[PDB]
């Protein structure tokens, strides 16, 4: 990368900056409302029609 930045096969000696590590990503974490529940409980009591 250093050679490409100077368009040359002979960069002068020195200390040079290079791009940083982008780190590493982990598995996702998500929070959203829950507890929908579909009101199906009437089927469990009384005599069915």
């Amino acid at each position: 990368q250093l050679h490409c930045s100077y368009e040359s096969f002979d960069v002068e000696s020195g200390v040079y900056s290079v791009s940083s590590f982008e780190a590493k990503p982990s598995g996702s974490v998500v929070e959203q409302a829950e507890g929908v529940e579909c009101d199906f409980s009437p089927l469990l009591s009384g005599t069915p029609p």
Binding site: S5, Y6, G14, S17, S20, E22
Partner: protein
């Protein structure tokens, strides 16, 4: 509660008026009292050194940017190269300065140095008490390096707000200073030990190695104070000097302008970094300042147009930033050149120039480390209680007109002292105090019409 503000005229301090003379004699104004005093200066010698990742500042590595960015890759090379050259110059300026700061030889530094002088500048064998007062007054953020990054990482306080750990997001790099602070302290301890011999020639390569107090008295004869006065007042002089020195412990206030300049230098560096940080949130009319947001909200044909708009404004900020750094780096270099000159004049030796150093003739001055620069202190001499006396251009033998003399570093005055039977007396230019005229205080000169015709008694020449 407060009343109304008061309009007021700016005062004009009139100079003491000294009526001229229209004969062979003239009024002379001479102080009869004096005090030591101090003035201070701050000279910046560096700009904090930074570099910027030219891919990371623009984007967070999202691939669409990485593809688009290739069109602009050459701009980044120009950015990195320019910053790099600026940083190299800062390092050369430091090395150049220190080459003149060092002395070939010095006294060892010991406690109790300077005799009766207080010398709070002595090292706590370390930096110095005064330098630490300055650094504690400074509001600058804690450094990184070691432990560095693990003070940024989740195992640390939730309250960190340092731009220093923001460095690991923005792609900033804050370069370490070229020199370890301990070596810097060593360079100025060497300057402390370079005092004496101050007189006896230029001092280029001899080292007198004499007590600090003795070098002071030599300097006092260098400004026209007679030796007789100095021997009588030695303890008095040390006491006045220490009072002036003691005031340095109260000198670190916001009313001290040199101190204020240090504070501004600290926030010049902070300001530049904060500007780049604020720009990360600056949408350019792009749907969001975030790349991930525009990716998640846009069909890719649209997405790339928005990304390009975002990139263009980001690159423009980086270009302006480089220009800003180049200007500041250059001004720092010039300031460093000034510092170099003062060390080789105002510090290493007494100077007759005026202007430079404290505004009270010149006696020894000191320098200490300060953030981004050097902090100077100058001890000065301040005249007081001026009186007017009769004085003559010179004296001659009335019986032998070719015998003419004139005072050296002082003036002939009509005597007003009861111990001197001689009608005339000699005093030093810096302080009123009559003395008998002797060959040590005079030199032979060609005769002149304004010289007094003495018909009675002159010892130099006796005849």
């Amino acid at each position: 509660v407060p009343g109304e503000m008061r309009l007021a005229s700016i005062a004009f301090n009139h100079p003491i008026q000294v009526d001229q003379l229209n004969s062979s004699y003239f009024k002379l104004s001479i102080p009869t009292n004096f005090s030591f005093g101090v003035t201070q200066e701050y000279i910046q010698t560096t700009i904090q050194k930074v570099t910027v990742d030219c891919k990371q500042y623009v984007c967070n590595g999202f691939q669409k940017c990485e593809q688009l960015l290739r069109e602009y890759g050459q701009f980044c090379s120009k950015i990195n190269q320019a910053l790099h050259g600026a940083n190299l110059r800062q390092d050369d300026s430091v090395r150049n300065l220190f080459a003149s700061v060092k002395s070939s030889q010095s006294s060892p530094i010991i406690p109790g140095f300077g005799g009766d002088f207080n010398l709070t500048l002595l090292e706590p064998v370390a930096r110095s008490a005064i330098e630490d007062l300055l650094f504690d007054k400074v509001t600058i953020a804690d450094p990184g390096y070691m432990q560095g990054y693990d003070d940024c990482m989740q195992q640390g306080p939730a309250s960190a707000r340092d731009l220093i750990c923001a460095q690991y997001v923005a792609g900033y790099k804050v370069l370490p200073p070229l020199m370890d602070v301990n070596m810097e302290a060593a360079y100025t301890s060497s300057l402390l030990g370079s005092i004496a011999g101050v007189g006896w020639t230029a001092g280029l390569s001899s080292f007198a190695a004499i007590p600090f107090a003795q070098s002071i008295f030599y300097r006092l004869n260098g400004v026209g104070i007679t030796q007789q006065v100095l021997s009588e007042n030695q303890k008095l002089i040390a006491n006045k000097f220490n009072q002036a020195l003691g005031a340095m412990q109260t000198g670190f206030t916001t009313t001290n302008e040199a101190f204020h300049k240090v504070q501004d230098a600290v926030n010049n560096n902070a300001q530049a970094l904060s500007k780049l940080a604020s720009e990360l949130s600056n949408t350019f009319g792009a749907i969001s300042a975030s790349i991930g947001d525009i990716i998640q909200r846009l069909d890719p044909p649209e997405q790339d147009a928005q990304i390009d708009r975002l990139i263009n404004g980001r690159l423009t900020t980086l270009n302006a930033f480089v220009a800003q750094q180049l200007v500041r780096s250059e001004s720092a270099a010039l300031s460093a050149q000034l510092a170099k000159d003062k060390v080789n004049e105002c510090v290493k030796a007494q100077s007759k120039r005026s202007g430079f150093c404290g505004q009270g003739t010149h006696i020894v001055s000191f320098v200490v480390n300060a953030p981004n620069g050097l902090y100077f202190m100058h001890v000065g001499y301040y005249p007081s209680n001026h009186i007017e006396v009769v004085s003559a251009y010179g004296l001659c033998d009335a019986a032998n007109p070719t015998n003419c003399i004139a005072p050296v570093n002082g003036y002939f005055i009509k005597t007003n002292n009861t111990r001197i039977v001689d009608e005339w007396s000699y005093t030093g230019s810096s302080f009123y105090a009559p003395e008998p005229i002797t060959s040590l205080n005079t030199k032979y000169v060609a005769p002149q019409v304004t010289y007094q015709n003495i018909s009675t008694n002159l010892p130099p020449p006796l005849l």
